[PDB]
Structure 1
Amino acid sequence: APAVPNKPVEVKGSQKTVMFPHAPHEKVECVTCHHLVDGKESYAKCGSSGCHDDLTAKKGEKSLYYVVHAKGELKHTSCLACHSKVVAEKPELKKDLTGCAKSKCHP
């Protein structure tokens, strides 16, 4: 695999950009997020052409907003789905990991 980035990286939408840190996710398997595509591994950007390249729609497989924020029923784990399970076990982190304002994603 390539080396994991050692600094936070940009995740751009149509209007806002959020910084993603790999360090706190050191014990999550790479494949949980960089999922297989047509049975092969890939570390391309999520919003790459032919991937989740619709930067304005809020629903649908092709929407980057949806694959990031949807709370349930998906084929792979979204950022908000996993963070909601962590907050049930560590409720002190609710606003940092799930808030829409003043959180670690949208400070």
Structure 2
Amino acid sequence: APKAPADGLKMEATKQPVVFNHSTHKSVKCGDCHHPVNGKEDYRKCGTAGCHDSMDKKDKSAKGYYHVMHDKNTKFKSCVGCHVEVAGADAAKKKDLTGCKKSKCHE
């Protein structure tokens, strides 16, 4: 299989870039992020032309790339969404997991 990609996978599709890692979400199910679409599962980029490319930000619906990265009220687990569940009420983590500034995502 293609397995997980290398590390240092960052995405600069917005004025605020982010750096993701697969060696960190190893315990996380691939289907947890790479939600199934059409019933098929594949390893593609969220910001794929035709997937999450709304560049609206202020939309929060689905196409909102910046919505599937923060918005928690989504049909699927969101970055911050899951993070919120992970960090929960542990403090510090929610500042480096769901933190707006000075976090693991945004620095």
TM-score bracket, normalised by the shorter chain, equals 0.7 to 0.9
Corresponding residue number in structure 1 for 2:49: 49
State how far apart, in whole Å, the 1-side matches of 2:29 and 2:5 are. Answer: 15
Could you tell me which runs of 5 or more consecutive residues in structure 2 were left unpaired when the two chains were aligned: none
State how far apart, in whole Å, the 1-side matches of 2:24 and 2:75 are. Answer: 23
* CA deviation vs aligned residue, 1:31-76 (integer Å, no higher than 9, x gap): 110111111112121111210011232322111000110022x211
In the superposition, the TM-score normalised over structure 2's length comes to: 0.88
The alignment partner of 2:18 has SS state of strand
State how far apart, in whole Å, the 2-side matches of 1:49 and 1:92 are. Answer: 35
Q: Aligned ranges for residues 67-78 of structure 1 at < 5 Å?
A: 67-72=68-73, 74-78=74-78
Corresponding residue number in structure 2 for 1:21: 21
The alignment partner of 1:86 has SS state of helix
Task: Give % identity.
Answer: 46
Task: Tell me if structure 2 keeps the 8 A contact 1:4–1:22.
Answer: yes
In the superposition, the TM-score normalised over structure 1's length comes to: 0.88
Distance 1:12 1:55, change over 3 A: farther
AA aligned to 2:70 is H
Bigger helix fraction: 1
State how far apart, in whole Å, the 2-side matches of 1:89 and 1:99 are. Answer: 13
Root-mean-square deviation over aligned CA pairs:
1.5
State how far apart, in whole Å, the 1-side matches of 2:88 and 2:16 are. Answer: 28
Could you tell me which runs of 5 or more consecutive residues in structure 1 were left unpaired when the two chains were aligned: none
